Subunit: 445 residues, 4 copies
């Protein structure tokens, strides 16, 4: 096959850029999709009964016609994140309503409104053909993908593309995701693949890594500096693990909170010492449904002061929202910043404002990451200061159980999946760098 | 009485520094105070029936001993602030708690832990005597005073004195307040008296104006900018009256929220066009005790777009708190700031975090201002760009009446208090500069 | 003649979008042109004997093809910026330098290097057709176009598009600039055309006014706040005419620097009072080619303190470069900001670093404005807050004389140029708003 | 002797705060002092020839009266700075000249108006007596000192105490410095002693460490973040050594410039990989006394890139000044920061402003450090993330010889001076944390 010929080119390790420019398009590429008719076959099932292995079809799909500022990507590996499972489960709504309302933009965007939806918001691969006006990416380049597609027509997002109102998540709100052998992205979603990682490790950190980078490291978020103390609220989790790594490498002290010594172990494995087991310590910040227990804030406060010897956290890395958020405002040191990018336990937060104004704290909402923030996060991955958190890797044919595993926190870390890659372990090109931190790269395994 | 010999020296106009330095110190002075035999007199009862007239006393108290870095000041006039209302009704907790808890600590701070507490967080007057090490001021100096008391012994407040862990509010978290004939003040709260205002006018702005300056104008606050749209709650009130002015003088367009049509015309007198009488529109942002009404939020946003031309506010000047805060978060422009220095209607804020993280908004805590911001605020008053909003003056014997006027929303500007000044109209040493801005000066009548 | 149809359809007052969409395009258009033939045929003599009239050509150049994300705009009027001065003057190097070898990249960047260069970096006109991918802008939309041009596939520009390494400047560092009949722009350069202004008025602020806004008003620049003092060099000129408006409207104090009592009195007209004439005081900041005299800085510092009653300027709006920059750093208040967007008198700046590091000042380089800043500056104009500063108006044929008058300082604010607009005075569709500020709108003529 | 009991108290351990309070103060203490009658012995002679061994007296001296907000310190160890070297030298001005009229200030200040000047601006010792009002420190606390004295009577330094006009460096512009066995300092000069260092090591970080901290790390300085690239000039020197450690502890990449292989290796022992021998590469940034050689700027930029792999530096840690500044401004990344602190080779800076405004770079001036920056800089030392750069220790008797060594660059790191301490190596109360950093602590061996 032609599909075969390209894989051999990637695997050769000697295919020049022009070699790639010479490989022919296959008319089809297998894909993990959803079919527009199977929407309601799932309405009325709980936290687990709606199931992803049923609505996930492995289709042979026609190749999209590319246009300006876009790249066809041969996908070695991708992943299954939260939006992937949710779409596979048609939560919250049906992603075909995204594809159709996003089809009202232009004829090129109409390409996305199709009977099927190719899922996938991550990507590690080789670019094959680039569209009109592309200059920055030659065929043959090893890439990962930032999953924020911005159109950038309104002026809003020209001092921060995260402000741009037409922001879409590639593979979730547009089509041609990465859970597939071929893919189409905007070249301003492409990032240089780190040479010391596997294909599967390379596309693992993804949105969750850049999201924590902007929230913790960038000046749009809390502007971590060396010496800061930072409370991190789900440290072994996706967001928290990378947020832990950034604290350590930025020169700061993570304080990691967890709900099992299994989770506590992964933070030690990453470099953390100061770890709180919120379940071991019996924290009940809400005495009921409507009222909080301010002594439960104070109890965590003093527990924090144990690992630090008196100081409070300059920064709280928030995301559980409703349950944690009262305490996280309380515990923050005077003039400190609470930064939020999610509200998993409930989006209606309640806090004691006295603690905000009298102590001059600030809550700063954060969301995803712009391309420059996504770049610098991927950069820190590429330089060896931040590490992928892969745990299980699947094969393309079994993306269902890939997404039922994530559907029930079956793993502690990320779930990658080989696409064109025949087996795991390929991709490296800087084995030295890889051997310097092998110890931590596969910590979540 | 040595006190009348002090007042007569002010009223002369030619008493120089050597004359105040020679004048004899009284042994007692008249002061409004709370007693620690009355500290729970109001307990178990509706916050509203809690009458300030039943808790405030006219007393004679002995002169305090002056420590290093302090000015003893003969107070011509002071003002009623909302923090005096709260002292007067022992909410949210009595002020004798932190009088004791900063009292017998260092011996010097032990001078404040008295059975009585004189209030008054503004003053305008003449320096009587200075403690050791004072160089910037001398007896006879004409002075107004802000209410920040910082020890500045900690490292923490040396990049912004507000972060001093021991920053107090003078006359509220400390004794020897300015609702009184003499006040005991750190020299680093002193600022020169605006020579065109009267005694009671000049004592009007210092607390509230400074706060609104840090909150709105400062880079430590919302860092407003010309052309911003700014939602200003309680826009005729204390903070509102200077906040509106800062939005106006800054080239911003305010949307002034008021509770009354007559008070909707002081804003137009002030220069504002965008006025929302919240009692007229009848917002019920809270459905019950525990549930807000997001459609009342949206109705508020609709009325703002009415004025701005479909634009959401860059900045919301918050201070109503609980009742208002949900709405405040909703209508704020994407990337906008919710800057809060208070919680009048309740400090247990609740809000939809989804509008904050996903729209990249910020809730910035504010609290008074550092000496630099107070200097800058008063400097603006002195230049005739910002103007006092004095509406009524009471006498030191009727201070408890005034506190009631503002406890209930009875009066909505700034209500003054004569201390040693026996009439109004005393104080102007710059008649011509006062002749230019008289109409705005007398705008709050 | 096709060009007539367009101008006729524009000149009417009911031309629908489908009117402009059906209209036929001319095979060519009149345009002001530097010739790469005359590259070094004026190389050797001083650039003043290089009168701009000799190098600028009026050529009937053909239409380039309308590329994606681009718009073909019929241009009623442009303006002269002195980035056209040393376009014509060919200094420090010819514009064809960073034009010619930018083709081997993408073929669509190659259209820009011809043997000719259409200059001009302002525009008021009407869009003809839109490139691929463009939804926001429709034929018949009346638009101004600021001159920021960014490809934005590099990630560096995604926190602010002006950190794009491919940020060029249309008409100065690209082809097909505003001094023509039609213009080829990126649609992300298009802004609402203020509807109360004429074609020529609406075209004048674009460049200088965005630069000034970003340089002085945005946090990316000086960050003006109310009460600042602001030394504005060239307050009369194209940059200064907006800076002065920003100082006054943001509530700060401008100290205006001019070289003619005529330009003083128009500054006084705009509302300023603290005015200095660098002809009259006779400032020699340089004793010779290589040395300065702090006696003269001090004397400049002296005069400034006359106006402000003892206060040094927080902000210096710099741009004359080497002759003033040394004086500008000395004069600025401690903790203050010298912000700089060019170097008219020469780019090798010389300053005494003691005044910088010991006084905590900062020098901030500014360049143009990202789209958001361009939209905020144009929004203020449109809102009637900032006014255009048109001086003279020329027809396109006499652009060389326009550039010569500015290149000699024989001018005041902005020199306009008619392109398609047969006569001055056309374009106004809000005479109500127009007739409210006409005295300040025509202040400069 | 009274002094031996104090020493004995300290060397014992044991001595509780009570016993330190009970111990008897000496009538006098031994000290190094300048004599008011000697300001002119080194008149007309080369600075190299001027000899502190003749100027520096070893006098027994009465201790001053203990003022408010002041602490009496038994200094175990001190250091010698360039500020100290110039004092011994009577350069630039006579340091007695400053005492005589800062004495003329308050009667408190007047205590420094002596015919002798105890020099010494770094401190390692034990608090003996507190003055009035002190709450943070008690008799027996182990302290180092920040050498900045601020009055703070002015509001200018209440947003950052470096803006306080009446600011002095203790032991240079105040008397009772730390080259003595007792020293008198304000309480807000005091920092806790890193428990793992010896007395002379804990006195070596001092002003150069905190200056580097504020210039690089603080948001008053460059605000470095992890992943940043930083050109550090003189990276083996005082500023540069600490600047290098700050780049490495915060997860950035220092690019160290040095002028010999023997210093290049010191940088490697500190942790630096990228190092540039200035004099090996032979950079002649100045063709002569007036013109620069920009292709030497370019060659510096080329070598930096070879280290970063293509990336220009986000931050240049400047301080050499005229010789280096053109290159510093040239090679910094688009949108990055030159942070300058001093100008050793010359304060008359010259640079091409084209690269400043067009690439949106900023020159930020920084001076010393406020107390919060000094606390945080000291604290990172205590964390064991920053280490002191001591290379040689003298006894108090040899302070004159020590002063010549630094005056003749006889050493690379800092020259400690034992004061009360008998031998080297005393003072470590945390041997385990010392063990884990030992080779880095002694890396200036
Ligand atoms: N990644 C991104 O870019 C963005 C993600 N989001 C949100 O991310 C998802 C949230 O999961 P994500 O962080 O990405 O990865 P995870 O699936 O690993 O998140 C699980 C973590 O959340 C913590 N947690 C959950 N509930 C609580 C609680 N009641 N109290 C304390 N901690 C709690 C848990 O910590 P513990 O071990 O202590 O139980 C757990 O480790 C949302 O679906 C949404 O997408 C939002 C914006 C951006
Ligand atoms: N943190 C700090 O440093 C400082 C904080 N403050 C705070 O400001 C106080 C506000 O009062 P102040 O500015 O002194 O002068 P006022 O009391 O006169 O103004 C408060 C205004 O807020 C409006 N308001 C009251 N209740 C509500 C409500 N439930 N919803 C919406 N708006 C309401 C009212 O105006 P209307 O009814 O007409 O709309 C009232 O005028 C806060 O309580 C707090 O004390 C003040 C100074 C400093
Ligand atoms: N970085 C960028 O992207 C942009 C920069 N610019 C700026 O344009 C120039 C400002 O001029 P512009 O607004 O375009 O129109 P002008 O060139 O006409 O205005 C320049 C003003 O600078 C005044 N000036 C003051 N001192 C000197 C001096 N020592 N030597 C020469 N002129 C002096 C001039 O006369 P007078 O004394 O009467 O005031 C003149 O009015 C700046 O140099 C800069 O290029 C403009 C747009 C964009
Ligand atoms: N009156 C004066 O002379 C002035 C002195 N200064 C000083 O600046 C600060 C320097 O601090 P500090 O680090 O402790 O001094 P150090 O003695 O510890 O070393 C400073 C480093 O500066 C480097 N350096 C010296 N000259 C040059 C040059 N021409 N180009 C590049 N690098 C150079 C050298 O590094 P290497 O040789 O290895 O490359 C030298 O080691 C001082 O605090 C002081 O204020 C500042 C302004 C004026």
């Amino acid at each position: 096959r032609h599909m075969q010929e390209i894989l051999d080119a990637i695997l050769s390790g000697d295919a020049a850029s022009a070699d790639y420019a010479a490989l022919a398009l296959p008319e089809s590429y297998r894909a993990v999709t959803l079919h527009k008719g199977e929407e309601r076959m799932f309405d009325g099932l709980a936290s687990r009964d709606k199931d992803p292995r049923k609505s996930l079809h492995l289709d042979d799909v026609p190749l999209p016609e590319l246009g300006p500022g876009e790249a066809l990507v041969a996908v070695m590996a991708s992943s299954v994140n939260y939006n992937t499972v949710w779409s596979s489960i048609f939560e919250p709504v049906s992603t075909f309503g995204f594809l159709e309302r996003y089809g009202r933009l232009s004829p090129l965007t109409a390409r996305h409104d199709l009977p099927y939806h190719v899922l996938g918001s991550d990507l590690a691969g080789v670019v094959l053909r680039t569209g009109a006006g592309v200059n920055a990416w030659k065929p043959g380049d090893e890439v990962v993908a930032h999953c924020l597609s911005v159109e950038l027509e309104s002026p809003d997002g020209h001092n921060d593309t995260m402000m741009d109102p037409e922001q879409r998540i590639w593979g979730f709100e547009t089509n041609f995701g990465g859970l597939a052998q071929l893919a189409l992205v905007k070249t301003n979603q492409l990032l240089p693949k780190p040479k010391h990682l596997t294909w599967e490790e390379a596309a693992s950190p993804g949105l969750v890594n850049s999201t924590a980078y902007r929230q913790l490291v960038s000046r749009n978020g809390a502007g971590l500096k060396q010496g800061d103390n930072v409370l991190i609220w789900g440290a072994s989790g996706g967001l928290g693990s990378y947020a832990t790594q950034y604290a350590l490498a930025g020169g700061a002290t993570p304080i990691c909170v967890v709900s099992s010594p299994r989770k506590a172990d992964i933070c030690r494995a990453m470099g953390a010492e100061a770890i709180i087991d919120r379940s071991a310590e019996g924290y009940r910040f809400w005495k009921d449904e409507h009222h909080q227990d301010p002594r439960e804030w104070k109890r965590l406060g003093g527990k924090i002061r144990e690992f630090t010897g008196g100081e409070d956290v300059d920064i709280v890395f928030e995301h559980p929202g409703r349950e944690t958020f009262g305490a996280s405002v309380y515990v923050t040191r005077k003039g400190g910043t609470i930064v939020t990018c999610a509200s998993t336990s409930g989006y209606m937060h309640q806090y004691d404002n006295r603690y905000l104004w009298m102590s001059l704290k600030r809550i700063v909402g954060s969301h995803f990451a712009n391309y420059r923030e996504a770049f610098e996060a991927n950069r820190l991955v590429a330089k060896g200061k931040i590490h992928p958190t892969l745990s299980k890797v699947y094969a393309l044919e079994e993306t269902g159980q890939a997404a039922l595993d994530v559907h029930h926190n079956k793993h502690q870390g990320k779930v990658g999946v080989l696409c064109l890659a025949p087996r795991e372990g390929l991709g490296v090109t800087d084995p030295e760098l890889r051997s310097k931190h092998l110890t931590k790269i596969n910590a979540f395994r």
